[PDB]
Structure formats: structure tokens, C-alpha cells
Design a protein around this ligand. Structure first.
Ligand SMILES: *Cc1c(COP(=O)(O)O)cnc(C)c1O
Ligand SMILES: *Cc1c(COP(=O)(O)O)cnc(C)c1O
Ligand SMILES: CN[C@@H](CC(C)C)C(=O)O
Ligand SMILES: CN[C@@H](CC(C)C)C(=O)O
Lengths: 363, 356
């Protein structure tokens, strides 16, 4: 059976790390908090969860996490409002997704609410690490790895679940929203139908490093991931893609690719779909978007805004796509960006507790 | 830029571990030797290579190797003959493949021959761990991982290269051929020995066992191309549609891992010059037709760990397909096995063997 949060043991740090403080530039994932969550699994089932001081992992050289990528991760944020209250954004969805990833890699199942309570207690211990300046947050990184001391490609008989925390700064410092330019080359493929692109597995990210460097050498910020002979737009780097346009039928709509296997089911992606549907001002649909559909809409002036969504960036505008050595201008910023700014404002007000919402979970 | 074997640090173990051998079946890669190789990389370059006692790794919890699969591995075997001398089978090809895997993941470059010398020195220290019994050898496992204490998906500013050794040790296999499962794709990374290509295969292997099959026959594309058998390369020995007797294996188009045993079987069969030996796409349509016409002689898998693995049944589209491999000898498999063992255990001298 699963580990219980009621069995959670707490060991406080004797050697605290020095906090950067307000004003100092926080770089994404480079600064770590004082404590971490740790829970072991073996043949006797799950062990008791422990909050221990931030320390290195001791792994056997043959650990299946290092040889056969029996690893998965999650990413969510904890936000601190002006009245010092810390809240998590739709953590249940990350727990749901984490369990789906675990099943795909034959890693041990756990109870979603027990892990959520373990993470809640961890953030509570390191509460003073959560920043409160505009746009800042505490990035939560749960990881589940196989830890079997065997070179045989099989289901691990030993595993480890750990959670580390990182205080992160504003993605758009000062509040000014800035766009990204994308490289669209069909030679590089992120995922395939029948593959594992719809799960947050470590294996899906390592191969993207070389492609991202090629995008940077070409003058772009990120990569537009194309799929199939029809060049279907799937992801923008590690973000889901959205297009706000007047469709071929003349109806104003917000479209994002459907969950067909090559798309990672983003929490922010689902939130934008839910929010747009609640307003009921325009059509909201999940449908395949191709490069030829994009080209046709751009020359006819039908495209209003194109953007990426994800925990790190929340909502990120796209102004340029380098496709077939030609620069395609996306008029996102000239159009406000009206919808992006509305999405960002509503998300900001919900996340920092200015507006009450069922999406928030208090710590 | 590369680490030098001349800069090798030796520590030597105080109180050695228990050495196995015959009697006990000995399961693959669960028993380890006394020493390991360790080399560290940072922004200023590589450090000194170390042969230190077998011990656990100490990794920062944000190590890119654990979050974004910045990891790769290799697999080669060391054999001990009757003259008690240890020899590695075509290790230069493994060094070549490792450097290609490193480049694909933006991991640090190294001199292939300096690593080979460091590995030779490691096996020389643990020379008594290499078994001499029939069908046994020492499995060499080199690994290169990203090790930067950062959560950003980027080129690592830190890395760790380590090599661990394992003393390791017939019946045909049944395969499940279901198109719904994809191992690798064109434009992907299936042609590199990266950890990421292996984790997803575990569930598929369990699904094969549920349907009564021992391993997975990986299919690709609309035309259902045969690619790999589990984590082995596939070979079909048949009388082709043109009437010529041939040995065929899928070509290196991006979805096939370029195996050393695969290349060796092609090279050996090429030298014989008795039948046609080609690298060409094999489809299920071509295989189905050939089985019903009785043209298929043998089907097998190839790999360092698995050697030459016979196939007797393929379950494709809810239909059982008997592969007459064991009823045809298996003539070619037994010939490949005897010639490989002669080269490997030093009964016959070859350019393929590297003396330790
Ligand atoms: C994490 C991720 C997303 C976005 O997910 P969020 O849960 O919204 O943070 C989108 N695409 C990919 C490929 C991702 O890895
Ligand atoms: C290791 C491996 C092989 C075989 O390679 P060898 O070098 O001959 O050991 C074949 N296919 C896959 C997927 C492999 O991982
Ligand atoms: C900037 N993006 C985060 C999460 C990705 C991998 C989904 C990171 O680099 O960890
Ligand atoms: C058929 N042989 C297995 C491996 C041995 C080590 C049990 C395989 O190739 O999967």
C-alpha cells in the first residue's frame, strides 16, 4: 500500500543555506531550499516519508534511473500573496499526471492525496523561502526514480520519490510581457503517436538540448515542434501551443492541439481552456493545427495571437516563426496581446489570492 | 581537452568482495567487481581518471541525469581463453558509438582511445573476476551522465563518466508484433544508446508476457517494418522473392541501434561469400507471404548480452505465425555461434580482438 503522510518524520537542518533576499536576481532552478522530501520503496512496499535537510543522493552505480531512464518528474508552483498566505495552483492535476507517468514506466503507485499532504508539509517547513515580489514563486519539483542495482532492463524492485524546491523570479521582470521567436524544422521530432510524449518523463527532454542549441545559433529563442508529413504544430519548447484566430468558417476561436498522444496534457493548458469556456465569448476547441493552415490564416490576416502555456511562463507570446528559412511575422504583440494579457491578469489574481478560486490549495 | 590514461589515479581496494563462478545460474548484471573507473568534467575541462574501489555515487538531487535523462551507456564483453589472457571484442566500435551518443546529448567529448586504455587498465586490475567457463564473460558497462546542480533543460556544465564491470553468463523466443507500440522514430534518437529509449520498453515487455510472448518485435511505419527484437537487432534468413538465398537485416535509417554483433554478423557472412547478405527493409507483408510459401529458414536476434537468439513464433494481428527456425537446424545460428566463440575465446587470432 501507499505511504502515509501521518507517518511523516521531520529532521530540521543544522546548517541553513543563505537566502538571496528581495532585489537579488533569482535564476530558474539554481537556488535550492533548506529541506527535501524523501520516500523509499522496495519489496516490503513503501517506507515512511521523511523531510530531511537538503543533501545529496547516494545511488548504486547500477541504479536503473541512470542506465535506463526509469525517471519522471513534475512541476508546479506555490505562490505567496501580500498577506503572507502560501497557495498551490491545481496540485491535484500534477498528482494525477505524476501517477500516469509512474504507471507508464512500471514505477510504484501511491495515493495522490498522501503525496499532496507530504508536499504541503515540506512547503510549510520552508515557508520563508517562498518569495512575495511581483511574479515570483516557489517551484516545486517532485521526482520518482527507479533504484534497482541491476543492469537488466526490467521493472524496478526498488524506487525513490523525492521533492526539491526552488525560489524563482518573475518570468517577465517588471511585469512587461515579451515575445519569443521560434525555429520550425521538421527534421527534429519531439514525440510520436504510440510513444511517450504525453507523459512528463525525463527521456523526452534530453534529446531536445541539441535542437534548442540549433535554434539559438539560428537567432531564435525556442523551438516549434512539428509533427507528421502535414507539419502539425504540437509544442513551443516545453510549453503547449494556442492560436487565437478567425477560423476558415469565419468564427472567432481559440484552438489548441488535441490530446492525441504527442501532446503533454498541461495544467496551464487545461486552465486556459476551462477559463475561456467559462467566459463563453468565443469558440474554444481542441483541433489539429498545421503549418499550411497557419500560412493561409497569416496571409488573410486572420491570426490575432499565438502563444505558449506552461508553469514556468504562464502565458508566453510568439511574434516570429522561422520556417523553411523564411521569417513569418505573427501579429501577437500588435493585437495587444489582448487575450494573453487577460489570461495572465486572471491567472495572477487567482494565484496570489486576490480572487478566491477553487483552483487554489492553501498550505 | 580529454582526460589522459597517463594521469590515471590508482587507489586499490582494502578487503575484496566475494567472487562467484559455476553452480549458481548467475543472473545478468547483478554481481559487480571490486573496482570502478570514474572521471569528472566541469566548465574548465576533464579531471584525472580514477580507478577507485566499487562505491556508491553521490549526486546532487537536481542532477540533470535524473531529471532530463542526460545519460548514455555502452555494453561490451571481455573474454578469457584457455591461455588465461583476457580480450575485448571490437571495443573501438563501442568507443565510436559512445562518442556519437555523447554528441547527441550535448555531453562532453573525450578521446576514444584514452578511454579504451583506462578501461583496459580497469579490467587488468580486476582480471581475476573474468570467468573462464563455457558461455561466460565479463560485461563492461561505460556510462556518461550530465551532472549539473540545475533544473534548467540545457547543456550540462558538469558531467560524470564511470565504468562498472559484471561477471555474466539455447531455447528460442516468441514475439509480440503489435503496431501500437513504437520504440523509435525517424528524426528521433533510437540509433543512439541513450537511457531514454529503454525505460518505456518495460511496460511493453510486460504486455508481451501477458499475451504469451517472451519478447517484443518492434514494428515501424504504415507498412509495418520489422526493426528490433526487444533490445537486440533482427536478422531473417530466407529464400527471397527473386529466388536467391539471403540473410537480411534492417538498414541504419535512424530507428535501428547500430549493434556491434549486428555489424560482425554481416561482416562474417560477407567474407564467406556463400549467399547474399544485405541491409534492407523487411515488412510484415513480405514476412507473412514468405512464411505461407515456406521460404523462411531462420529468424533471430543479435546483441552483446543476448549473443544469437532464435525466434520460433510471432503473434501478429491475433494470428500465430510459426517460424521454422529450430526445424531448419538452426544451421546459420549454430555456425555464427561457433565462429564467434572461436574468435572471442582466442582459439583463432583476429584483428577484432583487443588484448588486455
Ligand atoms: C511541462 C510541459 C508542458 C506544460 O505543462 P504545465 O503543466 O502547464 O506546466 C507542456 N509541454 C511540455 C512538453 C511539457 O513538458
Ligand atoms: C545494445 C542494443 C543492440 C545491440 O548492440 P550490440 O552492440 O550488438 O550489443 C541492439 N538494439 C538495441 C535497442 C540495443 O540497445
Ligand atoms: C523551464 N522548464 C522547466 C520544466 C520543463 C522541463 C517542462 C525545467 O527546465 O525544468
Ligand atoms: C533469450 N535471452 C534473454 C536474456 C537472458 C540473459 C535471459 C533476452 O535476450 O531477453
Amino acid at each position: 500500500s501507499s505511504f502515509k503522510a501521518a507517518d511523516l518524520q521531520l529532521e530540521m537542518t543544522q546548517k541553513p543555506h543563505k537566502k538571496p533576499g528581495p532585489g537579488e536576481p533569482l535564476v530558474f532552478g539554481k537556488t535550492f531550499t533548506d529541506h527535501m522530501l524523501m520516500v523509499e520503496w522496495n519489496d516490503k512496499g513503501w517506507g515512511q516519508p521523511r523531510i530531511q535537510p537538503f543533501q545529496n543522493l547516494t545511488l548504486h552505480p547500477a541504479s536503473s534511473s541512470l542506465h535506463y531512464s526509469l525517471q519522471l518528474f513534475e512541476g508546479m508552483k506555490a505562490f505567496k500573496g501580500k498577506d503572507q498566505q502560501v497557495r498551490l495552483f491545481r496540485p491535484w492535476l500534477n498528482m494525477d499526471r505524476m501517477l500516469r507517468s509512474a504507471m507508464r514506466l512500471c514505477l510504484p503507485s501511491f495515493d495522490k492525496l498522501e503525496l499532496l499532504e507530504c508536499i504541503r508539509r515540506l512547503i510549510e517547513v520552508d515557508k520563508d523561502w517562498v518569495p512575495d515580489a511581483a511574479g515570483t514563486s516557489l517551484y516545486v519539483r517532485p521526482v520518482l526514480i527507479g533504484n534497482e542495482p541491476s543492469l537488466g532492463v526490467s521493472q524496478p524492485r526498488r524506487a525513490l520519490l523525492f521533492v526539491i524546491l526552488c525560489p524563482v523570479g518573475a518570468y517577465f521582470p517588471g511585469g512587461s510581457v515579451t515575445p519569443v521567436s521560434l525555429l520550425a524544422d521538421p527534421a527534429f521530432i519531439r514525440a510520436w503517436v504510440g510513444g511517450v510524449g504525453n507523459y512528463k518523463l525525463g527521456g523526452n527532454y534530453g534529446p531536445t538540448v541539441l535542437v534548442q542549441q540549433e535554434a539559438l545559433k539560428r537567432g531564435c529563442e525556442q523551438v516549434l515542434w512539428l509533427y507528421g508529413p502535414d507539419h502539425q504544430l504540437t509544442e513551443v519548447g516545453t510549453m503547449n501551443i494556442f492560436v487565437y484566430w478567425t477560423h476558415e468558417d469565419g468564427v472567432l476561436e481559440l484552438v489548441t492541439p488535441p490530446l492525441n498522444g504527442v501532446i503533454l496534457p498541461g495544467v496551464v493548458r487545461q486552465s486556459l481552456l476551462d477559463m475561456a469556456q467559462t467566459w463563453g465569448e468565443f469558440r474554444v476547441v481542441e483541433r489539429t493545427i498545421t503549418m499550411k493552415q497557419l500560412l493561409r490564416a497569416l496571409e488573410e490576416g486572420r491570426v490575432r495571437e499565438v502563444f505558449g502555456s506552461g508553469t514556468a511562463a504562464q502565458v508566453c507570446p510568439v511574434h516570429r516563426i522561422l520556417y523553411k528559412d523564411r521569417n513569418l511575422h505573427i501579429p501577437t504583440m500588435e493585437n495587444g496581446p489582448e487575450l494573453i494579457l487577460r489570461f495572465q491578469k486572471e491567472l495572477k489574481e487567482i494565484q496570489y489570492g486576490i480572487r478566491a478560486h477553487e483552483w487554489m490549495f492553501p498550505v
